[PDB]
A paper describes a structure:
Recently, a promiscuous PHBase from the thermophilic soil bacterium Lihuaxuella thermophila (LtPHBase) was identified. LtPHBase can accommodate many substrates, including PHB granules and films and PHB block copolymers, as well as the unrelated polymers polylactic acid (PLA) and polycaprolactone (PCL). LtPHBase belongs to the secreted subfamily of PHBases, which most likely function to scavenge hydroxybutyrate (HB) from a few environmental biopolyester polymers.
To test the hypothesis that LtPHBase might adopt different active-site loop conformations in the absence of bound ligands, we identified new crystallization conditions that do not include IPA and we used PEG 400 as the cryoprotectant instead of EG. The overall root-mean-squared deviation (r.m.s.d.) is 0.2 Å, indicating a high level of agreement between the two structures. The two most notable differences are distal from the active site. Firstly, the loop comprising residues 221–225 is disordered in apo LtPHBase, whereas in the IPA/EG-bound structure the loop was readily modeled. Secondly, the five N-terminal residues adopt different conformations. These changes in the structure can be attributed to differences in crystal contacts and suggest flexibility in these regions. Slight changes in the surface helix (residues 155–164) appear to be primarily responsible for this difference. Most notably, in the apo structure Met155 is oriented towards Phe81 and away from the Tyr159 side chain, which itself is in a new orientation compared with IPA/EG-bound LtPHBase. LtPHBase is likely to prefer lower-molecular-mass, non-film polymers due to the apparent lack of conformational access to the catalytic triad, as seen in our apo structure.
Author numbering: 1 to 222, 225 to 302
Write the structure that this text describes.
C-alpha cells in the first residue's frame, strides 16, 4: 500500500543515478543508503526491477541509489573494474560513485554510518573497489558474482581474470589496504556467487573473500586477526529452489566480518529476485534480503 518514489537525478559530475525514497522518509531520521551498482548491459531501472531492492528499501525504511554506467563510459555498460583509472580514490568512477553518495547526503538525511555498496558482476567488482577506496564512506559491501581488488589492471587482462581469477589474493589484499590510505578500517563483505557461473567463474568469489581477509586483517593493525578460514559452514536449501553453502568468517573478537554464499548450479545472476529484471535467478536464496541483513548488522 504505502508507496515511495523512484527519482532520477544527475550529480554535479554528470553521473546519472536513480534514487528510491521510501514512504517512511520524513527527513527527521537519517536513513541508511544502499548504493546498488548494476552489472554489464544493465541500467538502474533493470537492476532495481530484478533485485527488488526498492521493495526492501520500502519495507526497511532505507534509501537506494543506482548510479548509471552509460554506454559512453564502457562499451558494455560495465563499471570499469579492470581499469587502473577506475581503481583509486579521488578520480574516475570511484570518485563519481562517492560523488553520488555525497549528492544524496546533501539532498536527504542519510545515516553516515549505514552507507553500503553492493552490485552484480562488474558492479560487484566496483563495490570491492568502493570498499578499498572509500572505506570512510561505505560501512560494508556486497559482492554478487564479482572479482577481487585489481583482479585485472587493464582491459587486456580482464577476460582472463573473469575465467581464471586474479593474482594472489593476499597481495591484492595488501594493495586494497594501501588504497585505503589513512581511511583504512575493516570493511565487512558479503559475497554471493553461482557455482555454474560461466561469465565470472566462481574462483573469483573465493578470491574476493581471501583478498578481503588480508585487507581487513591489515586494517586492524596499528588488534583483531582475520583470516580466510571459514569459522562456520552450513548447507542451506531453498524450498523448490536451489541449494547453497554459507561460509562465515569471524575475527578474533567474535564478530562476523565476512560471509560467502555459493549457490549450487546458479549461473551469472543475482540470487533470488524477480524475472522483472535481467540477470536474476529466482530459485536462488534471496541475496537482496541476505545482503540487507548483513549490512544493517555491520554499521560503520
Ligand atoms: Mg577464521
Amino acid at each position: 500500500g504505502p508507496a515511495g518514489q523512484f527519482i532520477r537525478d544527475t550529480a554535479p559530475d554528470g553521473r546519472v543515478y536513480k534514487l528510491y525514497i521510501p514512504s517512511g522518509y520524513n527527513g527527521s531520521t537519517p536513513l541508511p543508503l544502499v548504493v546498488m551498482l548494476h552489472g554489464c548491459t544493465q541500467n538502474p531501472d533493470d537492476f532495481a526491477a530484478g533485485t527488488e531492492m526498492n521493495v526492501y528499501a520500502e519495507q526497511n525504511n532505507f534509501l537506494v541509489a543506482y548510479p548509471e554506467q552509460p554506454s559512453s563510459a564502457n562499451l558494455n555498460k560495465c563499471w570499469n573494474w579492470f581499469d587502473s583509472n577506475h581503481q583509486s580514490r579521488g578520480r574516475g568512477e570511484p570518485a563519481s560513485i562517492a560523488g553520488v553518495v555525497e549528492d544524496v547526503k546533501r539532498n536527504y538525511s542519510v545515516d553516515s554510518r549505514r552507507v553500503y555498496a553492493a552490485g552484480l558482476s562488474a558492479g560487484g567488482a566496483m563495490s570491492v573497489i568502493m570498499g578499498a577506496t572509500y572505506p570512510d564512506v561505505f560501512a560494508a559491501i556486497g559482492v554478487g558474482s564479482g572479482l577481487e581488488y585489481k583482479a585485472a589492471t587493464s582491459m587486456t587482462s580482464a577476460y582472463m581474470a573473469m575465467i581464471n581469477g586474479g593474482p594472489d589474493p593476499v597481495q591484492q589484499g595488501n594493495l586494497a589496504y594501501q588504497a585505503m590510505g589513512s581511511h583504512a578500517r575493516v570493511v565487512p563483505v558479503i559475497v554471493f556467487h553461482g557455482t555454474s557461473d560461466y561469465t565470472v567463474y566462481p574462483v573469483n568469489g573465493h578470491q574476493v573473500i581471501s583478498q578481503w581477509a588480508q585487507t581487513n586483517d591489515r586494517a586492524g593493525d596499528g588488534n583483531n586477526h582475520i583470516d580466510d578460514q571459514a569459522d562456520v559452514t552450513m548447507n542451506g536449501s531453498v524450498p523448490n529452489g536451489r541449494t547453497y553453502t554459507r561460509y562465515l568468517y569471524k575475527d578474533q573478537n567474535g564478530n562476523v566480518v565476512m560471509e560467502k554464499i555459493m549457490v549450487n548450479g546458479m549461473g551469472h545472476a543475482w540470487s533470488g529476485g524477480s524475472t522483472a529484471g535481467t540477470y536474476t535467478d529466482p530459485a536462488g536464496p534471496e541475496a537482496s534480503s541476505m545482503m540487507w541483513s548483513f549490512f544493517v548488522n555491520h554499521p560503520k
